[PDB]
Amino acid sequence: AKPDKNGVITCKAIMLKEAKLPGMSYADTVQIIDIQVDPPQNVELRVKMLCASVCRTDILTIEGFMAPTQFPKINGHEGVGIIESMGPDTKNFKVGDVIVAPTLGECQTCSSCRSGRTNFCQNYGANESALEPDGTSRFSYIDSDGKKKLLYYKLGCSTWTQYMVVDSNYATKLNEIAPELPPPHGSILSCAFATGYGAVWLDAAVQEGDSVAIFGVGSVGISAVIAAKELKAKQIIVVDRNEYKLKMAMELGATHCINSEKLPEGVTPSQAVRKLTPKEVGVDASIESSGYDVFMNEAMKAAIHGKAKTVITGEGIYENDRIFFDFKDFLFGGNVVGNVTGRVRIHSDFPGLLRKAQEPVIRAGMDKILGYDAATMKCKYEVDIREGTPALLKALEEVENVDCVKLVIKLNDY
Amino acid sequence: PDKNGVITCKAIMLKEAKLPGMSYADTVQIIDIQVDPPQNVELRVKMLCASVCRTDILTIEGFMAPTQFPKINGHEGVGIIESMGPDTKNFKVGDVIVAPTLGECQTCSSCRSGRTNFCQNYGANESALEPDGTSRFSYIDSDGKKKLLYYKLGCSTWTQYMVVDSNYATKLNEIAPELPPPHGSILSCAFATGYGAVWLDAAVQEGDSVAIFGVGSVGISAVIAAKELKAKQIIVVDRNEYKLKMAMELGATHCINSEKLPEGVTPSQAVRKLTPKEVGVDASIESSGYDVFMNEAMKAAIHGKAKTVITGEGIYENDRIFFDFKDFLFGGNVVGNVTGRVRIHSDFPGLLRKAQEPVIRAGMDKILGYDAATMKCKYEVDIREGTPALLKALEEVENVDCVKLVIKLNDY
Ligand SMILES: NC(=O)c1ccc[n+]([C@@H]2O[C@H](COP(=O)([O-])OP(=O)(O)OC[C@H]3O[C@@H](n4cnc5c(N)ncnc54)[C@H](O)[C@@H]3O)[C@@H](O)[C@H]2O)c1
Ligand SMILES: NC(=O)c1ccc[n+]([C@@H]2O[C@H](COP(=O)([O-])OP(=O)(O)OC[C@H]3O[C@@H](n4cnc5c(N)ncnc54)[C@H](O)[C@@H]3O)[C@@H](O)[C@H]2O)c1
Ligand SMILES: [Mg+2]
Ligand SMILES: [Mg+2]
Ligand SMILES: [Zn+2]
Ligand SMILES: [Zn+2]
Ligand SMILES: [Zn+2]
Ligand SMILES: [Zn+2]
């Protein structure tokens, strides 16, 4: 879209009217509407989005996750686009750059950045207000009563829109290192792939000859399998109840699979994992990527006491917003870390991830996650924001299809 | 020892778990027991003193002992090798030893990692028995019948003589021959746990900020470590003002009485308010046993960068603890810790050298209320003075100013 004389763009975006509480439909809350996107201020990028792709956390967001008051909103944190314009103070970006902009920036000067061992930057942390720091939004719409109304972001931006505004301290560019990378690949690099790959590579720090357990092989868990295989793990144990995704995981380098719904009475997933290791010692690295609170506990219990790290990537709407651990196993060697975006720092680590993503085996793995067809640039599960709300609502139901690993939302021509 | 090498001595027997509504008198008694001679690589140890870890009181309440009663209590204590099994190496009769929960085989992938004491080969003896299902301890009951006593784990310390697998023992007498017994006793658990949690596990550096949740003997040992390592800020959280003041005397910079916070202010929010930009602490130590403080310690840590070290224990519903999910995902970093990650061969010799330094010794003396002239501690009971004196001492564990009760077992 071309801006009007005041620099405002009118474009399609996916609006969430309110939380979809249990028993409510997508139809109750989700609608494609025309929105107005204000021009970028200060160090902001306004970004022509190519595609978004559906993270389970996007579905949690529809259900009200981390948004007690921040409706109506434009959804989405997983996506890729092209810089269309920039605020006047912007440095180190140009119009035409291809960017992703995940939740955490990297100031490189706080004690967290300088530690070398985390991406939880003190200066560019999660924008939980879902607003600009002055309480405004670059997004608005004209409702049925003709009134101009504010739309919240997801966090520091929204990706389910033809045009997004994001603070450039959260952006990192793809076009210098990977000018030929297709859009849906760039989209999963913004969250799902970075998360599973980085949880294994950076956070669990998997070494050649390590044993790895992965609880949940959706897009995040399969990304973890691809990393564990690249890093020459001796053993890659995948746990899930979805036989399709367990089989995909086995095709991309998992060595052992466990269907948690088919375990003998009184055999826990952690016991099943331990049974596959020498003297039932457990795994060198335990990844949770399910959102199932039970699996966070089972992941902790699967890890070799003291030596191994359990990396929790999963998210969900839990009773009292709490998770639980078996205390005796926890005290006697538990080691559990929260992980966002795989610990992949947007300046220090993302460039090497992007170079890795171009290696043939890693690309084949991304193609499999996406069911990508390079001839048509279409993914197996794809919906286009220009095709209207009914198509989108059907696609959101089909996220639960057994063979839907990653739904893609096409936003603009490629 | 009799004709068969069996020692008859006093020990503190727990008959059954002390469940809520029961008294110490219901379950705790000083009795004469028989201690068999050591076999294989065992040490039989003349105990000098035990000292009361909060986990000793949890044991009385049934902690980790669903079936392992009756037992001799105790895992914190120090003694002198009286005899050894025929296969023992690297120990002599007369050596002063402690024998904590975890050994250090030095060859398993956990030992070889260099970053944990959770040895795969010498782990916790949860059976509370010898590997053949027998015990070195027994007693003659009122029926005149000979009956087995369980250990605590690999041994019991609340006895004049104990037997332990020498793969769990480490000697005090070469590095610290003049160390008083109660100091050796707290080195075996409380002081190693608090000091190690800060020094080894949280790896506190000069200029770091530290929060310690619970300033009993473990948390005060953590204060001593944080001071020794030149932490910029040492924040202590407790309900007990006497122990908070003691922590401040031994190096703490800021104290918070959790029971005097406004209802809407959490312990983690109070700790973060003491830190620049409410960023929280570089190292967060839980040493309370209060499940709430395990969650608050996790939340007080700088997101991602900092480590929360959980040392606390308790009897929790369904044996489960909980964490606030959003704060956990966005940077939580929590580890279970046993004995301060202090490995009995690689780390304990260094800890023991540290204990001999005047400031650290002064801190151990303050924990103990130790009088060097009388070798008496502020709170001390002798096993030879009878069950009623012990039952009153066990009640006095809860006294405001009781940091560490010592159970004297033999002349020093
Ligand atoms: N931490 C982060 O930065 C980050 C990034 C991506 C996603 N997430 C979260 O991580 C998780 C994985 O993301 P995703 O998009 O791959 O999710 P997904 O829903 O596509 O995949 C999760 C997988 O876990 C399995 N699983 C869920 N509940 C299960 C149960 N009860 N029994 C057995 N298997 C079960 C599912 O069958 C599925 O294969 C989600 O919880 C998501 O919200 C977080
Ligand atoms: N992990 C290990 O190897 C190891 C070693 C020693 C002790 N422990 C455990 O660590 C903890 C500390 O041991 P200790 O012997 O110093 O215990 P302690 O009982 O002497 O001291 C605990 C301190 O925490 C405070 N605390 C407890 N509940 C509180 C609450 N509700 N509000 C505020 N403050 C509270 C108490 O007032 C006290 O000062 C205990 O849970 C003990 O079982 C474990
Ligand atoms: Mg802005
Ligand atoms: Mg033995
Ligand atoms: Zn995501
Ligand atoms: Zn930073
Ligand atoms: Zn103890
Ligand atoms: Zn070992």
Author numbering:
A (entry chain B): 9 to 422
B (entry chain A): 11 to 422
What do the authors report?
Hydroxynitrile lyase from Linum usitatissimum (LuHNL) is an enzyme involved in the catabolism of cyanogenic glycosides to release hydrogen cyanide upon tissue damage. This enzyme strictly conserves the substrate- and NAD(H)-binding domains of Zn2+-containing alcohol dehydrogenase (ADH); however, there is no evidence suggesting that LuHNL possesses ADH activity. Herein, we determined the ligand-free 3D structure of LuHNL and its complex with acetone cyanohydrin and (R)-2-butanone cyanohydrin using X-ray crystallography. Moreover, the structures and mutagenesis analysis reveal a novel reaction mechanism for cyanohydrin decomposition involving the cyano-zinc complex and hydrogen-bonded interaction of the hydroxyl group of cyanohydrin with Glu323/Thr65 and H2O/Lys162 of LuHNL.
The structures for acetone cyanohydrin (CNH) complexed LuHNL (LuHNL_CNH) and (R)-2-butanone cyanohydrin (BCN) complexed LuHNL (LuHNL_BCN) were determined at a resolution of 1.58 and 1.72 Å, respectively. The RMSD between LuHNL_lig_free and LuHNL_CNH, LuHNL_lig_free and LuHNL_BCN was 0.524 and 0.309 Å, respectively, at Cα atoms of all four subunits. This indicates that the complex structures of LuHNL did not change significantly as compared with the ligand-free LuHNL structure. The electron density of all the structural features that was observed in the LuHNL_lig_free structure was also well defined in the complex structures, such as tightly bound NAD+ molecule, two tetra-coordinated Zn2+ ions, one hexa-coordinated Mg2+ ion, and S-nitrosylation of Cys265 in each subunit. In the LuHNL_CNH structure, the electron density of the acetone cyanohydrin (CNH) in the catalytic pocket was only observed in subunits of A, B, and C. However, the electron density of (R)-2-butanone cyanohydrin in the catalytic pocket of the LuHNL_BCN structure was well defined in all four subunits. These two complexes indicate the same substrate binding pattern in the catalytic site, which is different from the glycerol binding pattern in LuHNL_lig_free. In the substrate complexed structures, the nitrile group of the substrate replaced the water molecule observed in the LuHNL_lig_free structure to bond with the catalytic zinc ion coordinated with Cys63, His85, and Cys199 at a distance of 2.2 to 2.3 Å. The hydroxyl group of cyanohydrins oriented to form direct hydrogen bond interaction with Glu323 at a distance of 2.7 Å and indirect interaction with Lys162 via one molecule of water at a distance of 2.6 to 2.8 Å for each hydrogen bond. Furthermore, the hydrogen bond relay was extended to the O2D of NAD+ from Glu323 via Thr65 residue at 2.7 Å for each hydrogen bond. However, in LuHNL, it is the nitrogen atom of the substrate nitrile group that coordinates with catalytic Zn2+, rather than the oxygen atom of the substrate hydroxyl group.
